[PDB]
Design a binder for this molecule. Sequence first.
Ligand SMILES: Nc1ncnc2c1ncn2[C@@H]1O[C@H](COP(=O)(O)CP(=O)(O)OP(=O)(O)O)[C@@H](O)[C@H]1O
Ligand SMILES: [Mg+2]
Ligand SMILES: [Mg+2]
Ligand SMILES: [Zn+2]
Ligand SMILES: [Zn+2]
Ligand SMILES: [Zn+2]
Lengths: 65, 196, 84, 130, 559, 266, 160, 43, 138, 47, 114, 156
Amino acid sequence: MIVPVRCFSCGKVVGDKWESYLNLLQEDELDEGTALSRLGLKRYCCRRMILTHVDLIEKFLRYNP
Amino acid sequence: ASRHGQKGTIGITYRREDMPFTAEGIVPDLIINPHAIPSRMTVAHLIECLLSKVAALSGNEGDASPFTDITVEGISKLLREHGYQSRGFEVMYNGHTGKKLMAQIFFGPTYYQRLRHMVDDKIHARARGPMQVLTRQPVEGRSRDGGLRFGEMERDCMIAHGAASFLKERLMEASDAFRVHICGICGLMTVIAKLN
Amino acid sequence: KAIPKDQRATTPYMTKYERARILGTRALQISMNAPVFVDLEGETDPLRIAMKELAEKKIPLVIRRYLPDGSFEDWSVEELIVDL
Amino acid sequence: NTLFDDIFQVSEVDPGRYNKVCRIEAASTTQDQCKLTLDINVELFPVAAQDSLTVTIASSLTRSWRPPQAGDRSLADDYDYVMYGTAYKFEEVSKDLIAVYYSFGGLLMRLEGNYLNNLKQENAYLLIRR
Amino acid sequence: RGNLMGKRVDFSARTVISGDPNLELDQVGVPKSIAKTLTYPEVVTPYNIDRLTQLVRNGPNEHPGAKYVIRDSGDRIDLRYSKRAGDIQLQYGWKVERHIMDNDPVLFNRQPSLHKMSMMAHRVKVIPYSTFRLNLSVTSPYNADFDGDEMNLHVPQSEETRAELSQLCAVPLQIVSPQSNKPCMGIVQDTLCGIRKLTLRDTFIELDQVLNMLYWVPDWDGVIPTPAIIKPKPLWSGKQILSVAIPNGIHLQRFDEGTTLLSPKDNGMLIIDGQIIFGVVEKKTVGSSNGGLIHVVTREKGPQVCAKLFGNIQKVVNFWLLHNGFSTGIGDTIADGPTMREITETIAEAKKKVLDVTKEAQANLLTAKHGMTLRESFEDNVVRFLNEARDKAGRLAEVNLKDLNNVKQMVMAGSKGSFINIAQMSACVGQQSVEGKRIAFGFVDRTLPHFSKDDYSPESKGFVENSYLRGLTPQEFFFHAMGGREGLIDTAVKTAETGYIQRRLVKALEDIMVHYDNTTRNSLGNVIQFIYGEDGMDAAHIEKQSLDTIGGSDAAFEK
Amino acid sequence: EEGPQVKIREASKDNVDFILSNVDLAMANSLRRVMIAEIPTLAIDSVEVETNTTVLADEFIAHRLGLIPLQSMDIEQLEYSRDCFCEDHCDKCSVVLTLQAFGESESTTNVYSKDLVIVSNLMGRNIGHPIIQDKEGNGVLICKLRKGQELKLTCVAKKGIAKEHAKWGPAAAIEFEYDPWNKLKHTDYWYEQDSAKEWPQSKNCEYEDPPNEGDPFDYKAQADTFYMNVESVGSIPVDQVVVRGIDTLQKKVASILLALTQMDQD
Amino acid sequence: YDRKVPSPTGEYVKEPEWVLETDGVNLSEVMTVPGIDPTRIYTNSFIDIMEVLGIEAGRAALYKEVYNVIASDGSYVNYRHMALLVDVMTTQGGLTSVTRHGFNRSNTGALMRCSFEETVEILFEAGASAELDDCRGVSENVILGQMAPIGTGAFDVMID
Amino acid sequence: TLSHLRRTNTPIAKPRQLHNTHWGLVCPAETPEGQACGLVKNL
Amino acid sequence: EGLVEYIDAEEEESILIAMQPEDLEPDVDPAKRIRVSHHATTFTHCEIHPSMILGVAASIIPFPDHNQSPRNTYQSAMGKQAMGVFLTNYNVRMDTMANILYYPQKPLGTTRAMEYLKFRELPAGQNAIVAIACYSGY
Amino acid sequence: FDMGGYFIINGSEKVLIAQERSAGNIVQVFKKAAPSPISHVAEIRSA
Amino acid sequence: MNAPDRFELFLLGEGESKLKIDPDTKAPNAVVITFEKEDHTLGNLIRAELLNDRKVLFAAYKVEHPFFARFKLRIQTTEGYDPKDALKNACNSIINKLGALKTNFETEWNLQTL
Amino acid sequence: ANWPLPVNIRRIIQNAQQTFHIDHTKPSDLTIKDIVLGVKDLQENLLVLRGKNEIIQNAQRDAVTLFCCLLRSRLATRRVLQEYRLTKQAFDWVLSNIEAQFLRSVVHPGEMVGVLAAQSIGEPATQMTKVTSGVPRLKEILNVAKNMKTPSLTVY
DNA sequence: ACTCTCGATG
RNA sequence: AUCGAGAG
Ligand SMILES: Nc1ncnc2c1ncn2[C@@H]1O[C@H](COP(=O)(O)CP(=O)(O)OP(=O)(O)O)[C@@H](O)[C@H]1O
Ligand SMILES: [Mg+2]
Ligand SMILES: [Mg+2]
Ligand SMILES: [Zn+2]
Ligand SMILES: [Zn+2]
Ligand SMILES: [Zn+2]
């Protein structure tokens, strides 16, 4: 669907870090690890929360209704 | 269930305070019992946990393909390079008391899937409901507010116990109990009982 | 025909099924506001009252034990031994 | 009062797959017919090889165990390592050799002697010093 | 068979089951909705008129309440639609169908109902959430885990039938089973492993934790036990605080291997007067064994005391285990380097032996055993060699394991897992087999197209040198898949044919019982056994005792 | 002062790394638990949806709306809706903020937390404002709209405890570690060969003295030094997280004391 | 085979003997062979035991085989159960099977036998022969919905 | 869906056993259990 | 271009298949698995990749070669009962009943075969921070 | 992502499960049982 | 469906008192106090602070079931010492230590940067 | 020697040398007549059948033969006086307790033991995984196989 | 020759 | 009513 607002495990806000993450992958041409590290995602649960997520809403918006 | 034939329902839900926690403050989303490991021999579950942990930390995608030369030793070394116990263990603290735990816990990310079998779709209870027309017995089905079949094996169990009155209750009052008239001569249900 | 009160071969002890049947019957009687032959002493549960009533042998029932031939031996609850 | 008093010489120490308790083997330096086997919490009171430990068996110093308050109370020990157990077997090797078996919460003990006032009683305080 | 021998009934329920450490053995966790649904008719008496009036005042939707009210005329009052649901003068003799409440006798059941312990009477404890909660130690007779299992619950409708349930079908009354003259229930899983971890001689417990565990026992006398250690620090052993759970007058004696009243390995078991003297408590003791602790407590103190014993032991051990913790990782499946080397060289010399036997057989020097083919002898030899290889490497891996090894700990406690599990996970999973024989030639003179024809080598006929830790090769994987496949097949077949056999047996011995003369007969009066069991004893009250007059020398007998 | 001691090692807007000295284990643990659950926070509890033509479901949106971090500074001079003598909610108990989004451009129109507009009267209290730690200043990405998709709704935020729902969680992860050298031996380490070479070394080891092999086991030692790191989400500053945690624990102890005072009534 | 044998001094001592196992069965001519002990010879076929040594030996062999099957898995069942089964199989005079060919041909009740396997045909032949049902069978009272003579109902309760 | 669109049904010596010739054509693991085990296969 | 052939079982009967392409070439790591050296030469075909012996449901299993086969079968059965996104157009379809996971996640440990099964695009489960431990006993 | 390969009958998606059969026009010899009068049978299913 | 309300973890129900003081019938001069709508957070702390008092013989808390937010606390003190006073002293001690901790943390926080 | 019998005599004895706290250094206040005639008269009470004719009595003695053998084996004069060192009170208590437990161990009339047996054999057959053994062999036995799969002859 | 749960089509 | 899939 869309990026989860907060991390399940601990509770850190990660919903505001999605777009930025994408930028850090395409604009600065970094790898996923360093991008996740720069966003302040040290714990691997939040790091998971962003890395593991799939943005499906973009495919959902492809319909006209 | 996990991805290795390790199914199971939820026993209880604990809040983050009651949950055990590592020194980093990381709390498990899920707790499974170790006894579901040696008898079933699902090593690939553990290896999945290790690989997923390393891939999580490094931010890469762990390759869990069948026939490859990826070994538990390499994954262990990679995990140690990130500053953790190479075997996935982590020193955790009891959530209730705050005191450490003696044995360290195999702790890490594992891909779990939610199966279609939920309790509120299974739960059922009937106390005197709709009956059938042909046999005058409780209808069949949860969706039809039906009763449960007291099978032959159940009857056998109640016989083994010796509870005769209970067996009579299940087979009369609990199900279909009918009063009929019998002729004292031929002994058939020919009787035209004009009551009142 | 019948079987005399003497020369009775059946077990002098009360079987668990006889106990369950007697306690069940008595509790069934108490459950329909029937006179209690013992001191309640706080007890209100008909089963428990029937149990205390059995412990004092204040139950006016009798067991007709059937033999496979057709014979039958009668054993009053007051006479039967309850070792269970 | 007191039931037994002697000085033993530790002949062997054996950590049988443990890390807090070791089985000790000693003998009396007075009687040439007296020996002792005893499970010892090394983590509390370390017992190396070739040591001369002073061993005492008492019956007192039932009621609930009050914490040592204050004290300001008769400890009746001033030892180093004190335990409390229960005798469960009186083995008679010979007429001149009588052995006893104590159980200190699992930490067993076999004392072989000759001349005893050790009856099958819950009272079994084991006091070791130096 | 479908409408007379067995038919659908009212006052029944069914739900997914779950385990609950804080429930008693003879209890059942019943969801609130089911409690409001299922009902029991209770006649208005001077003893309960107030309570029943309060229940009717609550009505449905609120537990505890009532569904219907039956009057003298026989008319039924619906307490959810009637206008007079608020004001009701309960007359003596009226029936009140109230919600199921606590300590109510219900029948807990799980299909397939193979034996009588599949239907047992439990005490109701109304609880939230939508699951049938049951004690752990009641898992064994029902044969039930919690990976989606569902159980049924039936409710009695009169005093006599609930008397039948409470006085005959009660769970404590079913602890010692007449099936194998032994207890069919015991301590399992966490409570088992834990009780092995607690009774170790290295396990000492300080003041606070001891106080907590002590208070955790409902049958506690409130008397603090004098610590096994006084100075320099007051400490209690696991055995010492566990002794509180065991009732007084309980004596248990069992010698294992080198149990010499001093037991250097802390094996065996001696418990004097409800106080464990020595030995590690595990499956042989607190399990469902013949002369186990449960059997003794049941036969001595009684069934109630034994169920409460289950409760106490579970509470204490689960508490200690909760604050001690126990796990299992891949590290518990990794033997040492040189150990794996000796394993590999063991498989190597095994394959070498098989190679030599093969070459010998091909040289027509193989002399067939009397009564079998040359080829059958060859097969037998090779199979035996590979099996010996798996067992050898497995025993090596087992020896290499430490006492801190979690898997080995669970094996020691008897909680779960065995030797072959360690053998296959850490060393070598061994030879795969189908229909008794090793992997046959599906293709012409070969098992797979990746092999040449007439290749009777171990790796060709389905030998797996690799362990689950190392990983299986494609061939090994496929062969193992064949084996497992046959496993599932014959499993389904087995449960089917057994399913039939059970019914046949039941219908055959259906009308057989003991009459009032200890004569086992049927509905025809035909004597099957003149004295039941040829002795007239109930199988429940029978224990394996030694006849020490049949053994020993004549001189020893005389002496 | 005179009792327990604090040593702030690191300090920032989001984190506080400090050392709790001279304290019992149970008090540190309880402080942690209170910091996690029992601290009042303002978060969305009611969602009234007027029009919703977006991809996401209604309660799907309402959920993440509930998880939006809101300003909870003056939350102590706000009141529980269950305690206020008003019908449903008011300005003394709840904070109402609207959300009106609509697809305008051909490109995807994102709906963030900055689009939330406070409607109710705050009357001075610093409250209700959605925390935006975002660099661009957008905040939590709530939804996405296509071309003609509209999302119009209203949010009533109420005072709540994280014990009731994790959305009212003021803190995220609380780091907690005592005795980095296992000198108390509260943990029997697992190993295959060497216990020390396998298990990594904690940072807090820099702040304590390593054991000597010549020294026996100190059996009369307890737990005094604790190493903590409290992280805040944004609703409440870290210092105020731990302080209101302490005050909450103290207050709920004082309620028990008060109960004892009350049970003396005839 | 290994074997426990009473030593002349008293105790039981392991005395190993040679035993001839065999694929194939013909008890009627092997036991009469000069050279072997004709009192200890045994076959896994309780049929031949029943035919040669009698119905009692067939009973013992049947129980031996059933018990062997139960204990082969490593389990254990009390004697009286298997003994009851074997007895009920051997009391008719021969070896009564646990199928529709065996005990279902007995002279019991019509309803009882009808409640297993061949249902309708049993009722037919019972209706043609005009049989009398004693109604003291379990399944019969189960059908009639009456309190069967089972445990609790194995007697009567009156008042004195 | 993917699994259901690539399924194999078989009516009616040992058709249930995973045969050697099933290598590379039929999945060795993916099959129902309890009843139609071995009969119902997947490509 | 005569680089790949279509072989059925009957023709498979008369060929010699190489498991890996490295089996055509003429001190080790004790960690890896013991693989038997190629004692055959006259190859005619070579396997594309052994992992292609599995089906769609089995290809989702991580390290299936490290599992007991019936467990792989069980997971192959239960994978069809997991929830997630079955189709992108689930909101414009009127199915009898459908279940869609709130926040789907592409597994941290995947298979090279998952790429073609579109599993990382349409996952069916979440990466849960799991802990193997005896806690409260629940 | 929809792969197709299914039909739509009355709005219901239908899948034709592949049916496994024995190949025709193939010559196969089979050994018969012991009580059987015939020992071997060479048969072929013509199509 | 059958899940209880969340606020039942901290909100007292109809008629449910906060504390339930019961005379322990086991050992003399003992008491069992039922704490409603509270968990380990309070229980462990109070119990740990009741062991500091050297005039307290016994002190132990337990949560009989995780489903319900409540715990029992058993206290046994020496003769001439009412256990309620031990509970009060423990509570006040806790409050004082917490207050001092708050003051200390504040003073330490006022000396930081960033 | 180890065989399933009613009444655990060992536990009764070890309960006797615990309830009365007898010391192993004190003469027993018993007599040869006490022990011998006591035990001999104890067997008279261990009743399974209660008829007054010869047949039922023979069936009785035949039914309690083994348990009486065990009884004599454990309650021998030498064993009672030297191994246990019981007193008069303790010995009488042991006797009464043995009689009681034996009377408890008797099967209750009405016990549907046919079904109990069928289940006691059927249920463990469900937990079952060179001649034919296991479930197929059980099926052969129950069906009374005209032609069993593995006919064997064990010749001594 | 065991209990359940859904769907489909007449 | 039948059939199909699935749960222990
Ligand atoms: N046709 C049938 N008849 C009766 N029961 C059946 C059945 N099909 C399945 N079951 C039940 O389903 C259960 C399957 O559970 P499994 O998980 O296969 C046992 P396990 O995992 O091997 O043992 P474990 O829990 O000891 O590790 C069986 O125990 C059986 O009782
Ligand atoms: Mg299980
Ligand atoms: Mg199950
Ligand atoms: Zn996180
Ligand atoms: Zn007529
Ligand atoms: Zn308000």
